[PDB]
Symmetry: D2
Subunit: 240 residues, 4 copies
């Protein structure tokens, strides 16, 4: 079983991803292409490189090219310091290959939106938010119900039940209006296994806490995965 990805496989992965990104006019800088851009969600997912990114096999692995992760703390009244972590601006291009997924998870603080650039994106999510603590939460425009999953979706082996709670589905195509994923909502997405191209999606959200513009923000991790295996990994991609 694969426990890491070779330097060649990794470099070819991100190079082709950065090139596709540039072809689509996303502003890729050299610093955006690094050994952290290629994400493998769990040690058992490294097996995705056994057959490769074009095997069309179900695995939770992806590339994220982040052009912006602005705290937007400057000018903010000190009184709002306690909730600043729910704000900020983040812009990133995500590239997922055929059959691959961004594993089930939710953000206590981050609210995101999706803009499909190339290919089509199948989103799986829970329309009802998850109750974190309990404390009064604000409401305005709740998540739409969506539709039931279409048949045929193959989930990664050993991670399928972590998708159980994400009963809602939506298929986004390039040109569609922005789709918002409010914080506290479990969600995951994939590139259709029969896709001729990798899914390229622009995510515009609030700050992405993933280890200090603020003392409280130190060591903050705003990504909680349903599967415990997904947590450990993606903390540093193992490249041999």
């Amino acid at each position: 079983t694969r426990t890491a990805i070779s330097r060649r496989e990794y470099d070819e992965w991100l190079s082709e991803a950065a090139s596709l990104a540039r072809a689509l006019r996303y502003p890729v800088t050299p610093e955006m292409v690094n050994d952290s851009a290629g994400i493998v969600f769990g040690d058992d997912q490294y097996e995705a490189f056994a057959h490769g990114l074009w095997s069309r096999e179900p695995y939770e692995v992806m590339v994220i090219l982040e052009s912006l992760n602005e705290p937007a703390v400057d000018g903010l009244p000190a009184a709002g310091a306690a909730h600043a972590e729910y704000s900020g601006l983040c812009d990133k291009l995500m590239i997922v290959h055929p059959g691959k997924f961004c594993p089930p998870h939710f953000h206590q603080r981050k609210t995101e939106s999706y803009e499909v650039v190339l290919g089509e994106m199948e989103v799986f999510y829970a329309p009802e938010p998850v109750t974190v603590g309990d404390d009064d939460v604000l409401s305005f425009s709740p998540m739409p119900e969506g539709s039931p999953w279409p048949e045929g979706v193959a989930l990664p082996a050993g991670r399928e039940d972590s998708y159980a709670g994400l009963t809602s589905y939506v298929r986004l195509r390039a040109g569609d209006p922005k789709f918002v994923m409010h914080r506290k909502h479990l969600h995951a997405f994939r590139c259709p296994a029969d896709s001729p191209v990798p899914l390229v999606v622009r995510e515009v959200s609030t700050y992405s806490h993933e280890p200090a513009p603020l003392p409280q923000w130190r060591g903050l991790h705003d990504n909680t995965f349903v599967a415990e295996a997904a947590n450990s990994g993606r903390l540093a991609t193992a490249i041999a």
Copy 2:
């Protein structure tokens, strides 16, 4: 001197703007192409159409196609209600023709970022922030010093001194790193007058308050403060004949 834009001029202006957007892969739907997407900053700026958007003359006129303006209030602890207006998510595509400007102004709440898609953007701004609302504010990444103004910038007739406070300059090209314009900073920008194409830039920012409200204290909130008196009002509607 004219005080309005003909229906034909407005439609061609916005239709080409929306076509260019779609060509650049921006998500445009019909509701986005409306009567307030084409902004003329002041009644004296309607003169821009006397000769047209390709005359290369300096005027404060532009088109804004907004694909997103999410309050991002859902899920926020009730405790944060007071400053939620400083957050939110906004995504828009701005199109500025050769020599045209987005006039000097600042936002009390909105922090924005720039991504040039087509053409080049000349940004004029003030590195020092003003103080509006609260006088006890946070600080992390102060605005960069930028560069002195380049030579040969033509400013709008009658509006020249409104640019005096924008002493820093930076020219942004497609592919450059995102440029952040922190809230409470005076800024403006233009498409070089000698550009062969309109400037097309994506603005990713916090919620855009521009008159059911996400929150009661959000009703009628004005977040755009223009340096020039004549521009703060004008933006509030486009005279179409």
Copy 3:
């Protein structure tokens, strides 16, 4: 009735066309943007600028940005001089606004192909070639039958019967395979009147004879329009 287009209308027309072309990555050089790029097929078509390119009214007017018109006569055996005019390479981007058309016509010598870049293109043509002289003509892959015209197509006023012979129809969208229009076939096309964007199509064909790499090629005009009004015009755009 309009008898010309103003300099402002013309300059705005081609400027916005060149910009859209550049946005789509077509290689536009300054010399490609000239007072001949904007075509009006007949003096009576200048009325298209009465209400403008976004009136969605039926008129035969368009912009052609030609990046290549190579005779390809160099290296060609002298023995082939007599038929060289049927060869050559031409690459041009055509921009047609909503409801507008490229009038009915055929080329004795030029064979063309279409690649839709933006919008959708509705092609109207005669599946049977026109017999020019008579002389033995070669055959290989004749034009497909196509489909009958969909309902609702509005033709330019006073030119509608010139479309009578173009009984076949096909709708090309961006991403579709190349569509070939063999020489000697009458054809015309338009941008759907309800289109949100101008139709942008890349035409790759054999040499476009439109007034000398060869003595015979001097003064050669390979565009014959069904409507006599279309002929006279487009020989020089009247710009006031």
Copy 4:
């Protein structure tokens, strides 16, 4: 030293190539992504995958996605049958990775043009034509003189002198005027070795004869003559393990 490319390497190579093409708006259909679209010019060039298409090493390997190859014989006077093979219409997208080459060769019949879509193209060619077939040929626009070779070009090991006859050089960028390579002229090109992206260029040319024929005399017609012996054969198939 290897003599083939694994199935995985071939599929990733072509899938990324086709994805980049689609991103660049080129019309790609499934039949175009096949076992002969990935070309390795000679058995010794399979070594390119020992380290991969991103090693930046000099090898003669490339991908060609052909969207059109029209004989354009329909409608042609029977009198022109003899030289119809010099006409036709071909449209293909070529993808060359950093440092890789499309080896030295010439075409008796094919005249081609270049349009760089992504990256930059370094073209090496001979301004003087060879004489093949007929010795009485036409002339109108002789090949431009171009420039001397730039410094630092790394050529494929064992293939260096095959480039001796290509004394002219021209570097083409996206947006440049179309570049025509007349038939019967030796030429080759590469993607700069320091390029961050693969070279993507559209070739618009006359019919591509590369083994029902449009005409009987077209059957088995070979129109690619490679300078290096080892490359003329290799192109005729891709060893996939």
